[PDB]
Design a protein around this ligand. Structure first.
Ligand code: CDL
Ligand code: 3PE
Ligand code: 3PE
Ligand code: 3PE
Ligand code: 3PE
Ligand code: LMT
Ligand code: LMT
Ligand code: LMT
Ligand code: LMT
Ligand code: LMT
Ligand code: GTP
Ligand code: I49
Ligand code: MG
Lengths: 50, 140, 98, 320, 459, 36, 347, 55
């Protein structure tokens, strides 16, 4: 039938980055994303908020 | 149309059934004729006889609904001794809906018509009791 | 009202019914449209003349001039229709059904 | 002043610029018929602008930096693949033909715009009027389906009717055995796989449908392979034409203003080349088209309207 | 409220002016900061509400809903950034913009002093919500789900508009503080019956009431994860919050008008709870669980007692976090096996030990284990409906049994038993997923230590 | 991946009407350029 | 058409409307309609094809009939009052004839049949004039004669138009016909409130014109006349699809968009007059319009329809259509709700 | 029986059918000038004889 791209294969983030936190493919961005979530989420809102 | 509606609402509910059934049948007949006129003008019948058959079919179908509603709703008010009750119109409205199912030979249309026309008649009775305005006179 | 108004009002109604009940020729419906104007011209003239409304005496002329210009436009559309199909039959003007 | 009603009102009328030399000339013929060389000579001698035949990358040549774009931005149409596998299941045969008609339509619009804006005539190699000979040949060899032909005629019906035909049609008549001889001599590996039957169908369409049709409305000049070498004689024939037929005689400043308003707006020119007719050969799925379009926007000088691309050196953008 | 409206608006220039690779980092960080400042709304008094201005006020009802709303935005960004990774940059920013605009409407909706202002913002939330479902939903049926969601709401909300305008003509104001003092009793009449229905049906459809709930399982099965989170956590509570406010001006007619809707809710919760035992799609099961939990809230609101209003508020907050957790847990399985079928992937506790703990904790809150705020809210409702009529305890008790059965059934089927042999892509839980789960359960369980802040004005 | 309309879905909106009946079975989509 | 002639014909269309709006004499009102109708026919015919000739002829017959009925009402009014002042009429038969004549000119149901056919048969720019500017002159007459209009007649015309307009649009795939039926429904809102507060009629008319102009302009920018053609916009001008989505949701009356405002204020004015059943019926019936607006958004913006290979050739050329006032019109079409109290300028 | 059938039937499923049927009545017109102007005559007559809008 028509001209359509094939379905891509789902990529496991751990292949390229075994240390991946699951936020981003870029390891530097991935680590920063983990840090803001953990710092502003747990250290600030949950601890100081509590 | 204002003269017939004046006659119908002048009679007390649950009394003078034959007069009530005549007003609603004539009202139903008028609506049937109006529908037939537009139907014949906008959808040309194949022949003169086919146009007459369609006009009678719609007109009788509409007068049949108007008669059953008037008769059934007037008996319900008489039998129950409940004149100012919307439930009588709900019973009369659903009865007319069933006729439409029969005349259109269908069970879904009859059931749908019973509920929608049954509710509409009940709402009409409430508006008469509570003075609801459909075309309200400008006041402010 | 005066007796003449009966027939002049009737003439407008006859031409209005004629206009609304088409047959085949588009020209025939244009004639009914100009008949309507004619009855309007006569009724307006009678009212204005009888009441001695002096300045309104020009109004029927203005009505006549503008209505003739409208009729000229209608005739132009009729010939364009006739050029397309070879007749002025209104049954041919049904492409915009779909 | 960019052309428009205001420019037209102020005296930019076509009849001013157009002379008796303001002629649109098209050269036609079979494959390897020598039309390319004849077209250049005619243009040189008459001082006309020459348009090389519009191919798969004609549109790229008129936009951006003018260089051809990758193949995915033309749909992966390939003339080479057409010779290698004319019956390929991927629909390349008609996808190419539909793309080539749009390319020719664009070039014809460019040629008319040049003629109407400058007054200088043009020479084209084939046109939207003769493009169908390839489609008929394709269909008769069983390379495309009947539904492809129906699609082609729909697009042609609503596009070709907007434009005026050439003033002069020049046909070079080389027989099929000679064409095949010239194809093998040219030595292009893919072209040599052409069948004489395909070439005979091209000629049949040319002589059966094209030339008789254009004769009713154009000046049709025919030459053999030998007669086409004498370019001067061809140009002598052109200069002695009477121009007593065709709709170019009915044209006037009013009608040519509407025509110039059309050919200058290329999106309006190509409007009906993408009619929503879901033919498998030309239909592109949403995911592919979306992906390809994002790639196109990333090409140099293509993200923004021309003149607003800082990555290719445009300046004063904050005042433009 | 401008101290929350403006920084919420500023999230949009932040997302659009961020570096291409920092849109998730920046939007998540700053929406967590906004969530932090929202705790200042806890300045609540025993007698008076916190009346900021002519447009906005906060009280003990809207304050917990406001804090839940602003907390959910960073959680939604965390949950969405993975399945949107392939999406092009401009469309990623448009998605985040729809989430931000949803929060802006929500915080204004919950603090609007005037009821017609509440209406417009209450209606505005449809637009971004519909866009999120239809544009970024995965399957063909998102288009139908969008329509059912849109037209169920408008079928009820348009009559509410007429009723609200009618009330303002009669009373002269729709300011909620004014109505507290100028409220007059609603007398029996057919006009007042339909005024009552117009004032209530829109909120019933959103809750959703049993019989008007069929749009909700559709919406969830088709929505992306963030759509499901905001739908379950907050958007359902627009109905409850609306009902809690408007019932002020419907007395004493609510005494008898509530009967059909109490019957639908009381019987509805047992039906929907029973339905959960047979659901084959995990998202659909969680969706039906919401209908059952919110049937309790409808009953609580309709019987109008201090205990029922306190229980209704706690239930709305507790369910918001629990149902959002459950959707996030189900989504994390979907991102691996790409199917919502509950029976497809079994025995996941063997492969994902820590994720099975989150599954256990979420299930325990769903069945209302004491002393979670899920149980506190449910218990307060059960206590108050017992006084309303002692027989309700039988229906309330049966639902508690069925709720435990389907909650543990969902846990047992997906986490226990034997793993499915051919499913060999169950990769270890990401830090993002674990953090997302804990950002639901931890505030939920911490609220047990100070429940008063989620008990509402009647506390 | 996310479903997007295919040719089957899109052809639902390419007819003369949205709801074909016996009356309109003969209707055809008008010319692309309005010219008959 | 010669560009200078096209300008003079456009100015005559405007002048005819202006004459209707500034006249105190009934004859001048009639002249304004005659002049306006004469000048609009050439822009219906400009593309010279049988469909454009049929549309121009169907339009001419309808408008000429309506103008004859109008002149009858004027002459009957003269007979029974001896004056020509444009104001309330002095005879109920004259009022019915003028109301029916103006309903015919506006294309209100059941005099609506010409609107979808004429709009379909003329170019987009001509349809833009037909469905916006042409509403001004008849509505301005209704603004002045409304005290003498039969309430039952006008409200019946309004209710029918809202039903016919809503139902008629459900079956349409042609954009011009969708706009035509959408126009019919919106006229019903304008006349339903006229007996109660003409100011709200003006508000609805102005906002309707703005959103209608926006949609026609966006259709013209892409030369789209069918749903399927419009579904190719995402693969050419993605911004345009977002603007179309926002405008359609506004024409659907969804808060917080501008198109909620006229429906909101009409419901208020009717309820102040103890009209509850009618506004509620109108609001629920307007959901029919929202349905087929939403259908367009699905095929244009919220899903990506299949494309064609030749579309790639379009990626290399920019939009060169004027799109005059489009950025302003789209912002007014969607973002005006916070300024609703500004409606008092129309008082 | 209830949540996938009858609660569907009594409202969204039946309501959509009625509108679709009503739309086909309104739009299935023959495009004939004669039939449209004939309906205008019926409308004007009905407006007077039935509803007395001329009073
Ligand atoms: C309170 C309620 C809510 C607010 C209500 C506000 C109502 C709208 C206010 C009016 C807004 C008009 C648009 C503002 C101008 C923006 C465009 C612009 O800068 O053109 C500069 C204009 C040319 O800009 P351009 O590069 O051609 O781009 C045109 C835009 O794309 C745009 O081109 P265009 O095709 O869209 O046409 C725009 C303009 C025609 O284009 C123009 O020439 C600009 C004229 C704008 C006049 C603004 C007057 C406002 C004050 C009213 C008194 O139209 C007008 O003439 C305005 C009427 O430069 C001038 O010549 C200045 C005007 C000199 C007189
Ligand atoms: C001003 C006051 C006038 C009052 C009357 C208003 C009614 C005007 C109706 C104008 C729109 C009618 C268009 C329409 O509905 O189509 C014509 C329709 C034909 O439909 P029909 O033949 O009955 O069904 C065939 C299905 N197999 O014929 C009809 O059924 C239309 C009936 C409308 C009246 C109810
Ligand atoms: C779909 C087609 C059907 C369209 C709806 C049909 C109309 C239903 C009308 C119900 C009756 C409401 C009414 O007319 O009441 C009028 C009356 C105004 O009289 P007033 O002088 O102001 O006060 C004294 C009371 N006589 O008293 C009132 O004004 C009180 C009414 C307040 C406003 C009522 C709002 C509309 C009520 C109808 C919808 C209710 C059910 C909603 C169901 C939605 C389910 C999703
Ligand atoms: C407030 C609303 C203002 C609306 C302004 C809209 C401007 C017209 C739309 C701009 C798109 C570009 C354009 O030129 O418009 C198309 C049309 C011209 O037609 P076109 O096919 O482009 O070529 C004409 C030569 N025959 O342009 C026209 O012919 C003008 C038609 C629109 C005029 C009616 C505008 C609505 C009434 C405004 C009154 C506001 C109260
Ligand atoms: C303030 C008080 C008043 C409040 C009322 C509310 C007003 C809101 C409506 C304002 C008017 C609409 C203006 C919307 C601007 C849209 C611009 C935009 O966001 O980008 C569109 C995007 C750009 O695509 P492109 O042109 O190719 O450039 C990027 C290259 N990849 O194009 C795309 O990528 C297409 C993406 C797919 C489309 C998804 C649509 C969902 C997002 C909807 C956003 C608009 C909101 C619509 C509802 C309103
Ligand atoms: C799905 C629902 C669809 C829409 C349903 C709409 C329901 C609208 C309610 C019907 C209108 C109200 O009903 C109307 O009320 C007024 C109030 O006196 C009555 O008015 C009547 O008053 C007296 C009797 O009291 C009569 O002598 C007089 O002839 C008449 O004017 C009307 O005879 C009645 O028909
Ligand atoms: C759609 C039909 C198109 C063709 C129109 C044909 C022309 C119509 C001519 C109308 C002129 C007559 O108009 C009519 O005259 C009579 C004469 O007093 C008026 O008077 C009549 O009604 C009023 C009521 O208060 C009183 O004067 C009196 O009861 C009665 O005589 C009517 O109020 C007026 O409506
Ligand atoms: C007087 C009325 C006008 C008021 C205008 C006030 C603001 C004017 C801003 C002018 C500068 C805009 O800057 C222009 O847009 C963005 C943001 O900077 C930049 O491009 C952007 O790409 C991506 C986001 O898409 C990011 O990496 C980053 O945000 C930026 O690099 C352009 O490279 C720059 O040329
Ligand atoms: C009581 C208050 C709320 C009432 C709300 C009711 C209003 C209507 C809501 C749904 C509107 C959806 O509008 C339309 O509905 C029908 C089914 O109903 C959908 O159609 C769907 O069901 C029908 C009937 O089984 C199937 O034939 C069809 O294949 C399927 O797609 C349409 O694709 C949708 O466009
Ligand atoms: C409480 C009042 C609420 C008022 C809300 C009004 C909502 C109006 C919604 C649009 C109605 C028309 O919507 C249209 O309905 C029909 C019938 O269901 C659907 O039609 C679909 O279902 C029918 C039923 O089996 C199938 O035969 C048909 O093949 C299928 O296409 C259309 O796909 C849908 O586009
Ligand atoms: N399928 C297809 N091929 C085409 C079309 N136009 C050109 N071609 C091919 O492009 C190639 C070059 O065409 P020609 O100009 O005729 O050959 P040429 O030898 O280079 O030029 P001449 O010497 O003048 O004959 C040939 O293989 C043609 O078949 C077309 O419209 N469709
Ligand atoms: N005819 C109507 N009911 N409406 C109407 N215009 N009433 C006049 C009352 C009014 C309202 C607002 C303003 I500001 C002003 Cl100055 C006057
Ligand atoms: Mg060559």
């Amino acid at each position: 039938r028509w001209q359509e791209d094939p379905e891509p294969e789902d990529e496991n983030l751990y292949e390229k980055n075994p240390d991946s936190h699951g936020y981003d493919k870029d390891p530097a961005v991935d680590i920063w994303n983990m840090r803001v979530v953990f710092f502003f989420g747990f250290s600030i809102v949950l601890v100081l908020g509590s | 149309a204002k003269t017939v509606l004046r006659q119908y609402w002048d009679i007390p509910e649950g009394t003078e059934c034959h007069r009530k059934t005549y007003a609603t049948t004539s009202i139903g007949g008028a609506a049937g004729l109006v529908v037939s006129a537009y139907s014949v003008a906008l959808k040309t019948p194949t022949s003169f006889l086919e146009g007459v058959a369609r006009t009678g079919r719609y007109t009788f179908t509409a007068a049949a609904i108007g008669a059953i509603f008037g008769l059934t709703s007037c008996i319900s008010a008489q039998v129950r001794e409940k004149p100012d009750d919307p439930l009588n119109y709900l019973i009369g409205g659903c009865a007319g809906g069933l006729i439409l199912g029969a005349r259109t030979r269908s069970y879904g249309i009859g059931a749908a018509a019973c509920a929608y026309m049954g509710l509409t008649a009940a709402l009409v009775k409430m508006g008469q009791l509570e003075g609801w305005q459909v075309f309200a006179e400008p006041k402010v | 009202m005066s007796m003449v108004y009966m027939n002049i009002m009737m003439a407008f109604t006859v031409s209005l019914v004629g206009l609304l009940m088409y047959r085949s020729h588009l020209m025939s419906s244009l004639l009914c449209l100009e008949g309507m104007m004619l009855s309007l011209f006569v009724m307006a003239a009678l009212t204005i003349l009888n009441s001695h409304f002096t300045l309104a005496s020009m109004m029927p002329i203005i009505l006549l001039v503008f209505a003739a210009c409208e009729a000229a436009l209608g005739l132009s559309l009729l010939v364009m229709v006739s050029n397309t199909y070879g007749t002025d039959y209104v049954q041919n003007l049904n492409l915009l059904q779909c | 002043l960019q052309y428009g009603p205001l420019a037209y009102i102020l005296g930019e009328k076509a009849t001013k610029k157009m002379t008796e030399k303001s002629k649109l000339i098209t050269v036609d013929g079979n494959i390897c018929s020598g039309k390319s060389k004849l077209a250049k000579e005619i243009a040189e001698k008459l001082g006309l602008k020459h348009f090389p035949e519009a191919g798969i990358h004609y549109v790229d040549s008129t936009t951006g930096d003018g260089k051809p774009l990758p193949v995915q931005f033309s749909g992966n149409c390939s003339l080479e693949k057409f010779y290698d596998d004319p019956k390929s299941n991927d629909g390349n045969s008609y996808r190419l033909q539909a793309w080539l008609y749009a390319s020719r339509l664009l070039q014809y619009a460019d040629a008319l715009e040049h003629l109407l804006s400058t007054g200088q005539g043009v020479v084209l190699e084939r046109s939207i009027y003769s493009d169908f000979v390839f489609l008929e040949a394709m269909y008769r060899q069983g390379f495309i389906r009947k539904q492809c032909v129906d699609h082609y005629n729909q697009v042609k019906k609503v596009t070709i009717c907007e434009y005026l035909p050439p003033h002069v049609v020049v046909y070079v008549d080389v027989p099929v055995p000679e064409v095949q001889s010239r194809i093998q001599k040219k030595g292009n590996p893919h072209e040599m796989k052409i069948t004489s039957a395909y070439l005979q169908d091209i000629e049949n369409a040319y002589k059966g449908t094209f030339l008789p049709e254009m004769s009713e409305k154009c000046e049709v000049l025919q030459y053999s392979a030998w007669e086409a070498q004498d370019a001067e004689k061809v140009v002598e024939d052109i200069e002695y034409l009477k121009y007593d037929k065709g709709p170019w005689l009915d044209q006037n400043d009013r009608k040519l203003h509407k025509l110039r308003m059309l050919v200058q707006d290329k999106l309006e020119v190509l409007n009906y080349t993408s009619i929503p007719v879901f033919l498998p050969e030309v239909t592109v799925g949403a995911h592919q088209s979306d992906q390809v379009f994002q790639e196109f926007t990333e090409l140099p000088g293509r993200k923004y309207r021309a003149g607003y691309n800082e990555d290719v050196g445009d300046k004063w953008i904050w005042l433009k | 409220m401008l101290k929350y409206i403006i920084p919420t608006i500023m999230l949009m220039p932040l997302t659009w002016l961020s570096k291409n690779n920092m849109i998730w980092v920046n939007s998540t960080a700053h929406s967590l900061l906004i969530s932090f400042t929202s705790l200042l709304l806890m300045n609540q008094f025993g007698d008076n509400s916190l009346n900021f201005s002519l447009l906005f006020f906060s009280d003990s009802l809207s304050t917990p809903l406001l804090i839940l709303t602003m907390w959910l935005l960073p959680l939604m960004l965390m949950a969405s950034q993975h399945h949107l990774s392939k999406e092009n940059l401009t469309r990623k920013k448009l998605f985040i913009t729809m989430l931000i605009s949803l929060q802006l409407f929500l915080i204004m909706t919950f603090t609007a002093m005037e009821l017609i202002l509440f209406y417009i913002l209450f209606e505005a939330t449809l637009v971004p919500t519909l866009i999120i479902i239809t544009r970024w939903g995965n399957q063909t049926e998102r288009l139908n789900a969008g329509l059912y969601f849109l037209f169920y709401t408008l079928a009820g909300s348009l009559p509410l508009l007429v009723a609200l305008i009618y009330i303002q003509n009669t009373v002269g104001s729709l300011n909620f503080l004014m109505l507290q003092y100028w409220v007059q009793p609603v007398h029996n009449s057919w006009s007042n019956v339909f005024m009552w229905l117009a004032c209530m049906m829109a909120f019933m459809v959103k809750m959703p009431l049993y019989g008007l709930h069929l749009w909700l399982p559709k919406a969830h099965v088709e929505a992306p994860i963030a759509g499901s989170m905001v739908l379950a956590a907050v958007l359902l509570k627009l109905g409850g919050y609306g009902m809690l406010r408007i019932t002020l001006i419907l007395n004493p007619m609510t005494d008898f008008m509530a009967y059909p809707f109490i019957m639908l809710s009381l019987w509805g919760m047992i039906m929907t709870s029973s339905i959960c035992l047979r659901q084959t799609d995990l998202k659909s099961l969680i969706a039906y669980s919401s209908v059952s939990h919110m049937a309790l809230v409808i009953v609580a609101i309709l019987i109008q007692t201090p205990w029922s209003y306190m229980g209704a508020t706690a239930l709305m907050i507790a369910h918001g976090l629990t149902s959002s957790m459950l959707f996030c847990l189900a989504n994390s399985n979907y991102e691996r096996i790409h199917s919502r079928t509950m029976i497809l992937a079994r025995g996941l506790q063997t492969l994902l030990p820590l994720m099975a703990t989150w599954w256990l904790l979420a299930s325990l809150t769903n069945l209302a284990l004491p002393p979670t705020i899920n149980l506190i809210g449910e218990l307060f409702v059960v206590m108050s409906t017992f006084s309303w009529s002692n027989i309700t305890i039988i229906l309330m008790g049966v639902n508690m049994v069925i709720t435990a059965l389907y909650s543990l059934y969902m846990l047992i089927m997906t986490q226990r038993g034997k793993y499915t042999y051919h499913i060999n892509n169950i990769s270890p839980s990401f830090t993002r997923e674990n953090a997302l789960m804990s950002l639901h359960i931890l505030p939920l369980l911490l609220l047990t230590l100070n429940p008063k802040i989620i008990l509402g004005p009647l506390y | 991946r996310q479903w997007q309309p295919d040719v089957e879905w899109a052809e639902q909106y390419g007819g003369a009407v949205m709801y074909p009946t016996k009356e309109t079975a003969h209707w055809k989509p008008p010319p692309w350029n309005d010219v008959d | 058409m010669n560009p200078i002639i096209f300008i003079i014909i456009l100015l005559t269309i405007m002048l005819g409307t202006i004459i209707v709006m500034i006249s105190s004499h009934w004859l001048l009102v009639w002249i304004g309609f005659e002049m306006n109708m004469l000048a609009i026919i050439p822009i219906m015919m400009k593309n010279h094809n049988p469909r454009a000739t049929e549309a121009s002829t169907k339009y001419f017959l309808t408008q000429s009939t309506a103008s004859m009925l109008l002149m009858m009402a004027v002459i009957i009014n003269l007979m029974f009052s001896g004056q020509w002042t444009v104001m309330k009429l002095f005879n109920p038969m004259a009022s019915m004839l003028m109301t029916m004549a103006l309903a015919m000119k506006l294309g209100m149901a059941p005099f609506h049949f010409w609107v979808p056919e004429v709009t379909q048969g003329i170019p987009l720019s001509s349809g833009l004039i037909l469905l916006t500017w042409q509403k001004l002159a008849p509505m301005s007459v209704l603004y002045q004669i409304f005290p003498s209009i039969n309430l039952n007649l006008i409200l019946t015309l309004s209710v029918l138009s809202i039903l016919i307009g809503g139902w008629g649009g459900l079956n349409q795939t042609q954009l011009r016909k969708i706009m035509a039926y959408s126009s019919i429904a919106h006229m019903g809102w304008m006349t339903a409130v006229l007996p109660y507060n003409p100011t709200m009629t003006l508000l609805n008319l102005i906002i309707y014109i703005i959103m209608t102009s926006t949609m026609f302009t966006m259709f013209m920018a892409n030369s789209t006349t069918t749903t399927l053609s419009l579904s190719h916009t995402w693969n050419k001008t993605p911004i345009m699809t977002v603007l179309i989505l926002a405008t359609l949701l506004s024409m659907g009356g969804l808060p917080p968009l501008s198109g909620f405002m006229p429906k909101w204020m009409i419901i208020q004015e009717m309820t102040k007059n103890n009209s509850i059943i009618l506004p509620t019926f109108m609001a629920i019936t307007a959901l029919l319009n929202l349905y087929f607006y939403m259908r367009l958004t699905y095929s244009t913006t919220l899903t990506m329809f299949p494309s064609t290979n030749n579309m790639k050739m379009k990626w290399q050329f920019p939009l060169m259509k004027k799109m005059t006032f489009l950025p302003t019109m789209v912002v007014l079409s969607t973002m005006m709700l916070p300024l609703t109290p500004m409606l008092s300028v129309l008082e | 029986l209830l949540d996938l059938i009858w609660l569907e039937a009594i409202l969204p499923k039946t309501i959509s059918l009625a509108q679709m049927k009503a739309s086909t009545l309104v739009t299935n017109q023959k495009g004939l000038i004669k039939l449209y102007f004939l309906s205008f005559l019926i409308t004007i007559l009905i407006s007077m004889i039935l509803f007395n809008f001329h009073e």
